[PDB]
Design a protein around this ligand. Structure first.
Ligand SMILES: [Mg+2]
Ligand SMILES: [Mg+2]
Ligand SMILES: [Zn+2]
Ligand SMILES: [Zn+2]
Ligand SMILES: [Zn+2]
Ligand SMILES: [Zn+2]
Lengths: 50, 17, 67, 48, 55, 49, 338, 101, 335, 98, 243
């Protein structure tokens, strides 16, 4: 046989899982933190093991 | 140890890719 | 950062010896040289692999952003 | 001689005019195109 | 006169060895080259007075 | 034959940029020499530049 | 900032003349000299006096549902996905600017890199002046390649002249293979005896399990290091009998063999390789631009012009200074020279 | 039938054999040195030596010059066969020692 | 001289073969088997599951080095080549983690896999005869315990350390049967692949294929394959008394002994000797000792990375040299 | 200081001597066709082609080269006067040409 | 130069031509220009070509010649203690060429008890590989370290060291291969003589031959520097202290 291949935001300090609705804010909802980071992509990323 | 594996196992990986 | 899997010069696996080296140093404390020799790190390249490693990943993990 | 990277040889070019002596070679270079090194990046037609 | 006896000689044969048999040369070393480069040495044959920098 | 051939070949060729060649031949050595006058330790002569 | 390379001080392969270094392939494979560069790009979605502002909407798809190639790693929000690779030409910030700063013209941030990067961080925030702020961190792993610069704490810097297979390297009785080979010719004129003492002290330290000291006016005495070396079976002066990796025979000279701390410098050839055939020109002078970022050309200055004149190459002068720099077909009146 | 592996270099070849350069692709010092040693053990061979012209190319030029007895091609063939026989001897000794221990 | 490599205080002498016709008027040492056959010897000092120590006696340096080079860079082995990250939220970058996984040696027998053909599209290139699939799914959580505050992160977090043993073999197709009796595991299960904190997760799978150490070091099957010429110590004149003890202290502990009675020093074990030529700096044994190395006596030490036995590695190296000689002989010479 | 002063003397002397070139009548002239040297160096010899010490021919090396290239143990050595007769047969056409 | 397309990202050059450029492979960057017209291209390769510019125009002395490791390898090969059997000699000649040059093996210097060639014969074959090569070189040169012969009346090649080079018919009869005979600034140089007698192509062939030979020879021979090379002897300690 063969073998084939194989918008959440994060609060910078409280690490909460944010989902920013259409034009709401750029602030965390649990604490007032204004820094949000994109979560890692859900799709496959392939690397050479070298 | 002291037992041959080359005799009993056919070396496939040694063929030129 | 984290201990390299293999010695740069030899290719000998040293990534499975970091923790045993740390426990040799801490539990029933040994000198660094005898701890390295007890792990089979005979050649000086494999010796320096463990002797000179700076475990920076532990310091990096203090800033874990996904708490 | 000077050794030149293939990456900079694929962008640095010489404007070789087609004659009766090198037409086959330049045809092969055009077929190769701009992405494999023994190739060519541009063609300037005689009447254009 | 001249006080060349008070200068640092060395053991080098000047390029003009086919004219005079000089095995000595007053010298001083200056690093007129970059910090990555080494130092440069200057020479002056005592048999003919011919100067040259061996770098 | 060798000596005459070498002498004939040694003649300056017409069209030579001999002025530019001389300028570079006199100026390139002028880049390896210090602006300050450095003398051997013990000469004690007049400090002619 | 560095690594303790196994170093054999010997002439080897002829690619190590003039400061150049011989690096071991398969030491690079195992992670020696492996580094990465992280680069941030900052864009602000600025509000305007017309109550309009920039937006980061986008990620248009093709009819099969897959994003177009320009938007392969862009995410639904219009900002590149963390972990995804960006090749040259792809957009990772799809910023649209109003045309009356209702209608938006595209001003996306496009990756212009000879080698691909990976988006490792996308930060969305605001500044103190209530304005959107997008920061994207692009990381890029870097293999030590030919022309990358290294140094050894003693002013002995150099680029990688050659990368050689491990089996081509000289080896000792235990099979130890140098990570780096440095030319002995760099020593006699530079007089870095401290580097030799560092090699011996580091060898004694690795064999003894103790980090040694090379402190100014002090440090670990050379005789104690030689005692450690002898007591462990090595030559007192750190010179080992090696075998040739390519002939297998004993090298006729003993080779200075031991660990030396080597720093990889920030000057990698990947950021220096530049080549322009044709492209951007400064309109004022109609000459090629000035920088590797703007794809500028190399300036043939007065000194190079003088060298070409001294060669007597009139046609090359013409080709370099008019034909390939600025050749304008002007109309001149023969009556009045205007 | 590999027509790209070994190539006679006609520019570096004498009339009526006895001197030739062979270009061998995908080979390096490993085969070059062993083959050179074995060929040099041939009494008719007066010159054996290989070179890897450039590290960037998986290539090997081996030079053979003989006396009038045989040709460079025959010397190369004899050397290759003798290398095989040497490898057989080593394999047999190693196998019998492994079995015995 | 005469087969002995000269170990002097400043130089090494007599390092070349000198065993060919044309070395001298006696055109001896011309090649023939049944001379090499009777001369050549193999002495296996020790054999282990991963380390072999054996002697190749009366063989040429070029042949022995060919074996060493082939062992290092031409014996194929299986290593991870492509890593597919479904999720990696650890502090270690994906490229770094992929490189570490590739460096992990796998206890999978070569010749049980087929070389990947590079001329195939990525969706038909990987087959069950070509590839081993290794999965890795680790998630960190806070330990539901109450130990001493801020202890070591082993009873403080769950799965804080990712080890090579967490790489799970995922049989594909007929691999469910062929590998049933020998499941693929890392040769060193306790390699520290990653360290990670609560909320961090690594989810990947890796495709492991045959490869060559010359291509990438991860494919090299020996942690070091090497040899050394057998040392030779010649005591030219008797050394006795305190001079004998001084002479004995210049060699590794068990190299040369002191006779009881006769009281003279004697060479007890030159195989134990590392050639530091420490005797050659003392001027009192300058005329009393000659240091050498037997040029055609090779003490091979082959230590396996873990995938195959060192005896198999050496036999494969000899086979590879023979096979390349055979293939070259069969190849037609092109003009 | 040397790095800062590189490209100054060469540039100045270049501005001075740019246009001096050897003419086809063996004169060094400006670009205004004015004579600077009626003959270059008063010799007409290129410094690049001087094998000797600012002289065109290395007599000793040339003599040894001729002796070795024409060496023949089965050849008769000339008398001292016959050597000069050959020398004056070759030189003297050229000497009386001037 | 003539372009040679290579896989890496650097402008590589032969170290022999580093001296005119004043380059030292330590991060140095150099500019490469491609002439676009036929006339400019011909002018470039015929007036500014490396082979046509082996001599500096300021003095006529050679400026493209052996650099450090090439000089050291040549000196070690031609050292009076260098003797090579037939196999080693032929391997040296194959490395000297690209394994594509015919060599007429001369009679060995030593015929009893063993057929041994000296390194000076190796360099003679470097100068003139076979009879079809026209390079016949005759040369008298002083090495930079020349101690005079034992007597005033004794000739120059009888130096107590190998300080005087004699080449007669492309055969090196005495003297080591030195900087003064293979490097820059000397008009008694081997490459200078080859140039002035047989052409830039012959001189460049000899220089390439030497460069390849040294690049392959030094690594397999072994040349190293260590702390013991700069450690003073015990007697020097007392002598220096009292002095
Ligand atoms: Mg520099
Ligand atoms: Mg530099
Ligand atoms: Zn928050
Ligand atoms: Zn190691
Ligand atoms: Zn003088
Ligand atoms: Zn007008």
């Amino acid at each position: 046989x063969x073998x084939x291949x194989x918008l959440k935001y994060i609060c910078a300090e409280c690490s909460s899982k944010l989902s920013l609705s259409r034009t709401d804010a750029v602030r965390c909802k649990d604490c007032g933190h204004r820094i949000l980071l994109k979560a890692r992509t859900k799709r496959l990323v392939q690397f050479e093991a070298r | 140890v002291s037992r041959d594996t080359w005799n009993t196992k056919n070396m496939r990986s040694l063929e030129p890719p | 950062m984290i201990v390299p899997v293999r010695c740069f010069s030899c290719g000998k696996v040293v990534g499975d010896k970091w923790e045993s080296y740390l426990n040799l140093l801490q539990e029933d404390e040994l000198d660094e040289g005898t701890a390295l020799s007890r792990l089979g790190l005979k050649r000086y390249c494999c010796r320096r692999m463990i002797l000179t490693h700076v475990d920076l990943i532990e310091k990096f993990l203090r800033y874990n952003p996904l708490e | 001689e000077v050794a030149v990277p293939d990456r900079v040889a694929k962008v640095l070019t010489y404007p070789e005019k087609v004659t009766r002596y090198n037409r086959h070679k330049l045809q092969e270079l055009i077929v190769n195109g701009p992405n494999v090194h023994p190739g060519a990046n541009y063609l300037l037609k005689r009447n254009e | 006169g001249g006080g060349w006896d008070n200068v640092d000689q060395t053991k080098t044969q000047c390029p003009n060895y086919d004219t005079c048999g000089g095995e000595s040369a007053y010298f001083f070393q200056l690093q007129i080259r970059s910090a990555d480069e080494p130092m440069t040495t200057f020479y002056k044959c005592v048999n003919c007075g011919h100067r040259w920098k061996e770098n | 034959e060798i000596a005459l051939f070498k002498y004939r070949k040694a003649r300056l060729e017409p069209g030579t940029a001999i002025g530019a060649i001389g300028a570079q031949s006199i100026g390139e050595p002028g880049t390896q020499m210090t602006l300050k006058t450095f003398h051997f330790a013990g000469v004690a002569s007049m400090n002619v530049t | 900032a560095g690594q303790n390379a196994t170093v054999a001080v010997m002439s080897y392969s002829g690619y190590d003349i003039e400061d150049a270094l011989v690096l071991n392939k398969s030491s690079i494979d195992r992670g020696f000299g492996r580094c990465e560069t992280r680069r941030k790009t900052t864009t602000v979605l600025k509000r305007y006096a017309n109550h309009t502002q920039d937006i980061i909407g986008g990620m248009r798809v093709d009819e099969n549902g897959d994003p177009i190639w320009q938007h392969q790693s862009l995410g639904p929000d219009g900002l590149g996905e963390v972990g995804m690779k960006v090749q040259s030409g792809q957009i990772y910030i799809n910023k649209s600017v109003p045309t009356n700063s209702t209608q938006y013209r595209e001003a996306p941030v496009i990756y212009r890199g000879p080698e691909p990067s990976h988006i490792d961080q996308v930060m969305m925030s605001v500044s103190d002046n209530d304005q959107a702020l997008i920061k994207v961190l692009l990381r890029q792993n870097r293999r030590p390649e030919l022309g990358d610069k290294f140094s050894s704490r003693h002013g002995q810097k150099g680029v990688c002249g050659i990368i050689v297979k491990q089996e081509d390297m000289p080896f000792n009785d235990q099979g130890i293979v140098p990570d780096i080979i440095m030319n002995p010719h760099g020593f006699p004129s530079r007089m870095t005896v401290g580097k030799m003492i560092e090699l011996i002290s580091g060898k004694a330290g690795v064999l003894n399990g103790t980090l040694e000291y090379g402190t100014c006016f002090g440090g670990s005495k050379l005789e104690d290091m030689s005692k450690i070396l002898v007591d462990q079976g090595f030559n007192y002066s750190g010179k080992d009998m090696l075998y040739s990796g390519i002939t297998g025979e004993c090298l006729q000279a003993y080779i200075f063999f031991g660990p030396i701390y080597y720093q990889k410098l920030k000057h990698m050839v990947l950021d220096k390789m530049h080549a322009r055939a044709r492209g951007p020109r400064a309109v004022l002078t109609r000459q090629p631009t000035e920088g590797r970022s703007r794809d500028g050309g190399l300036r043939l200055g007065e000194m190079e012009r003088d060298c070409v004149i001294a060669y007597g190459a009139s046609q090359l002068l013409l080709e370099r200074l008019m034909i390939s720099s600025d050749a304008f077909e002007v109309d001149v009146c023969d009556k009045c020279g205007l | 039938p590999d027509r790209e592996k070994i190539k006679l270099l006609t520019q570096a070849t004498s009339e009526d054999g006895t001197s030739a350069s062979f270009q061998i692709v995908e080979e390096d010092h490993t085969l070059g040195n062993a083959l050179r040693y074995v060929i040099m053990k041939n009494p008719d061979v007066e010159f054996c030596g290989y070179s890897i012209p450039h590290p960037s190319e998986n290539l090997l030029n081996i030079r053979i010059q003989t006396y009038g007895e045989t040709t460079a091609v025959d010397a190369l063939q004899k050397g290759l066969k003798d290398l095989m026989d040497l490898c057989d001897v080593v394999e047999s000794k190693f196998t019998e020692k492994i079995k015995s221990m | 001289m005469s087969n002995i490599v000269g170990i002097e205080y400043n130089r090494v002498t007599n390092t070349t073969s000198t065993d060919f016709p044309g070395f001298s008027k006696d055109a001896e040492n011309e090649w023939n088997v049944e001379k090499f056959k009777k001369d050549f010897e193999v002495n296996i000092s020790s054999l282990d599951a991963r380390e072999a120590n054996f002697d190749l006696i009366n063989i040429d340096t070029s042949i022995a080095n060919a074996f060493r080079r082939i062992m290092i860079s031409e014996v194929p082995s299986v290593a991870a080549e492509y890593v597919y990250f479904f999720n990696n939220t650890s502090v270690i970058q994906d490229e770094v983690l992929a490189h570490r996984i590739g460096l992990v040696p796998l206890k999978v027998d070569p010749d049980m896999l087929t070389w990947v053909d590079s001329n195939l599209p990525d969706d038909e290139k990987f087959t069950d005869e070509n590839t081993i699939v290794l999965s890795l799914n680790v998630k960190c959580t806070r330990n539901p315990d109450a130990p001493k505050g801020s202890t070591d992160p082993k009873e403080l977090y769950n799965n804080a350390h990712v080890y090579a043993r967490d790489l799970k073999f995922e049989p594909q197709g007929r691999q469910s049967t062929t590998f049933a009796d020998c499941p693929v595991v890392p040769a060193d299960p306790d390699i520290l692949l990653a360290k990670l904190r609560p909320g961090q997760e690594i989810s990947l799978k890796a495709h492991c294929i045959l490869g060559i150490g010359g291509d990438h070091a991860k494919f090299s099957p020996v942690s070091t394959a090497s040899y050394r010429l057998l040392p030779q110590i010649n005591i030219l004149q008797p050394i006795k008394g305190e001079s004998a003890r001084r002479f004995q202290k210049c060699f590794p502990p068990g190299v040369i002994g002191i006779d009881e009675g006769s009281d003279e020093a004697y060479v007890k074990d030159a195989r134990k000797d590392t050639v530091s030529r420490e005797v050659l700096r003392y001027e009192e044994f300058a005329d009393k000792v000659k240091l050498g190395r037997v040029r055609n006596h090779f003490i091979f030490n082959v230590e396996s990375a873990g995938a195959m036995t060192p005896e198999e590695i050496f036999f494969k190296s000899v086979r590879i040299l023979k096979n390349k000689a055979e293939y070259l002989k069969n190849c037609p010479i092109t003009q | 200081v040397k790095t800062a002063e590189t490209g100054y003397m060469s540039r100045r002397l270049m501005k001075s001597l740019e246009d001096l070139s050897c003419q086809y009548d063996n004169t060094v002239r400006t670009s205004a066709n004015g004579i600077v040297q009626f003959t270059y160096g008063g010799d007409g010899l290129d410094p690049l082609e001087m094998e000797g010490n600012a002289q065109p021919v290395n007599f000793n090396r040339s003599w040894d080269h001729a002796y070795n290239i024409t060496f023949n143990n089965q050849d008769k050595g000339l008398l001292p006067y016959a050597i000069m007769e050959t020398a004056n047969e070759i030189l003297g056409p050229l000497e009386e040409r001037l | 130069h003539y372009a040679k397309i290579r896989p890496w990202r650097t402008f590589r050059l032969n170290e022999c031509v580093c001296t005119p450029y004043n380059a030292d492979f330590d991060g140095d960057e150099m500019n490469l220009h491609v002439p676009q017209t036929e006339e400019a291209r011909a002018e470039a390769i015929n007036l500014m070509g490396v082979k046509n510019n082996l001599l500096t125009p300021k003095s006529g002395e050679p400026i493209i010649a052996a650099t450090q490791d090439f000089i050291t390898g040549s000196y070690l090969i031609s050292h009076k203690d260098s003797f090579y059997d037939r196999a080693t000699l032929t391997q040296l000649l194959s490395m000297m060429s690209d394994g594509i040059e015919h060599f007429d093996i001369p009679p060995p210097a030593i015929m009893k008890p063993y057929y041994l060639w000296t390194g000076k014969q190796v360099f003679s074959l470097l100068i003139k590989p076979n009879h079809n090569s026209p390079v016949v070189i005759n040369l008298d040169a002083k090495n930079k370290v020349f101690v005079p012969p034992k007597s005033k009346s004794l000739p120059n090649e009888m130096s107590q060291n190998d300080g005087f080079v004699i080449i007669r018919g492309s055969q090196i009869l005495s003297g080591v291969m030195d900087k003064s005979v293979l490097g820059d600034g000397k008009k008694h140089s081997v490459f200078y003589t080859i140039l002035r007698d047989y052409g830039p192509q012959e001189a460049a062939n000899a220089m390439n031959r030497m460069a390849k030979l040294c690049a392959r020879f030094l690594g397999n021979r072994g040349f190293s520097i260590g702390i013991n090379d700069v450690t003073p002897a015990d007697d020097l300690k007392q002598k220096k202290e009292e002095l």
